[PDB]
């Protein structure tokens, strides 16, 4: 629990930083 909840926390921070920095509809194909 101590190790894998850090790994999931890594995947959670990346998935936020992809969500904030990306206009999911606008033009942006093939990004990240």
């Amino acid at each position: 629990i101590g190790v894998t909840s850090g790994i999931v926390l890594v995947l959670l921070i990346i998935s936020i930083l992809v969500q904030v920095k990306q206009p999911r509809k606008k033009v942006m194909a093939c990004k990240t």
Binding site: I1, T4, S5, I7, V8, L11, L12, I14, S15, I16, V18, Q19, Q22, R24, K25, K26, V27, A29, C30, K31, T32
Partner: protein, 152 residues
Amino acid sequence: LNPLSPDIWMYVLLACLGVSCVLFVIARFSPYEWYNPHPCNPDSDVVENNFTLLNSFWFGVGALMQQGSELMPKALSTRIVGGIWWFFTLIIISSYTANLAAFLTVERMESPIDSADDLAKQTKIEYGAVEDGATMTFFKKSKISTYDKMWA
């Protein structure tokens, strides 16, 4: 909430946070999930992606609870994520509901000894009668096997 151990209820709940972040990264990374909207106007560079961080987490929860959701994945890449999360939540529920039969009863708390036979073989439970009575004198002057061990 018992038929899975409290480390499994944490490993399932970390898997929903796990797979939905894996599904959101792959859906934005895969070039086939970026479909073109507006089929009525099929000439614009406005290709969109329906997987948000919302909809990725509610494909993970929506398939965990057998009801399913919107946004079936559209790729060879995001359907292996969705296809292996359907096999995960198939077994976790089939392991839950096949173990929950034992935890809605048990067998409602019976006694460790149920006769004088079971009570003769145990040293864990002490037992006696009234001294100088007719119950002590029964075991004193008996010679049947069980009721003489209870006087020994």
